[PDB]
Amino acid sequence: QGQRVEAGHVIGLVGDDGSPGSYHLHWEVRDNDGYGANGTVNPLKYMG
Amino acid sequence: QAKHGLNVDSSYMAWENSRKQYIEFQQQSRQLQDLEQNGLIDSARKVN
Numbered sequence: 001q002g003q004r005v006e007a008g009h010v011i012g013l014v015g016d017d018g019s020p021g022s023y024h025l026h027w028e029v030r031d032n033d034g035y036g037a038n039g040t041v042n043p044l045k046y047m048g
Numbered sequence: 049q050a051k052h053g054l055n056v057d058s059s060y061m062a063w064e065n066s067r068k069q070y071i072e073f074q075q076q077s078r079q080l081q082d083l084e085q086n087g088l089i090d091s092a093r094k095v096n
């Protein structure tokens with residue numbers, strides 16, 4: 001927490017919290033630091 | 049003098065001033081760390 005990370009920095013490993021057996025990564029992009037669906041942007045469209 | 053209680057009244061003022069100075073120094077250090085975390089001050093300037 002509070003660490004400055006450069007581009008290409010290793011963040012962590014993928015997990016299987018949702019569907020055990022298959023691993024995935026929940027990736028979400030926001031304009032705010034909230035916890036809801038009000039302000040969410042599709043990561044694929046944003047990175048495109 | 050402090051042991052025999054002669055100068056307790058006189059020394060209390062300087063003791064409080066020293067305590068306030070120490071608290072101010074600690075607050076300044078924490079403030080500088082928070083400034084680094086925000087980014088307003090670079091690592092090179094933080095050392096200075």
Ligand SMILES: [Zn+2]
Binds near residue numbers: 026
């Ligand atoms: Zn998901």
